[PDB]
Amino acid sequence: SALGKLQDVVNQNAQALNTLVKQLSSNFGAISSVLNDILSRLDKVEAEVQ
Amino acid sequence: SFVIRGDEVRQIAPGQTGKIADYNYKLPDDFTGCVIAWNSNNLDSKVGGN
User: Fold this and answer.
1) Cβ neighbours of residue A28 under 8 Å, at least 6 residues apart?
2) What is the helix, strand, coil percentage profile of chain B, to 5?
3) A18, B3, B4, B40 - which has most CB atoms within 10 Å?
4) Do B29 and A43 touch (CB under 8 A)?
């Protein structure tokens, strides 16, 4: 527990980089978060909106 | 310039799919322009069918 200042710097960079990856699973209001799922399910002019 | 039945006019638009759109006359996604249509039954129909 003495080395908490270095462990904190390891943990913050790992927790930021995992949060960046989990944001790929998010919809942001799109019909799906999987990019090929949109393109397989929707007509090309609407797929560009999603 | 061309002739079609009144039901088919909806296919004359950018990003459409259908028999007229895909096998007779296709418009691009960046189409900058106007689509003008009018009834021609008086010129283009004939007795027993034209």
Assistant:
1) none
2) 30, 0, 70
3) B4
4) no
Neighbours of B9 (CB within 10 A): 13
Resolution of this entry, Å: 3.0
Q: Hey, which residues 7-46 in chain B have their CB within 8 Å of chain A?
A: 15, 17, 29
Q: How far apart are CA A31 and CA A42, in angstroms?
A: 10
Burial class (CB in 10 A: 0-12, 13-18, 19+), A31: middle
Please indicate the experimental technique that yielded this structure: cryo-EM
- Which chain A residues touch B if contact means CB-CB below 8 Å? 43-45
Which single residue is written with the structure tokens 């010129």?
A: B43
B43/A37 Cα distance (integer angstroms): 49
Residue of A nearest to B14 (CA): A45
